[PDB]
Amino acid sequence: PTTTPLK
Numbered sequence: 001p002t003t004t005p006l007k
């Protein structure tokens with residue numbers, strides 16, 4: 001249910 005500084 002989250003994310004991260006992807007490309």
Ligand SMILES: *[C@H]1O[C@H](CO)[C@H](O)[C@H](O)[C@H]1NC(C)=O
Pocket residue numbers: 003004005006007
């Ligand atoms: C966001 O960065 C995190 C660092 O722990 C992970 O590498 C995660 O897979 C990244 N999200 C995406 C969509 O690449």
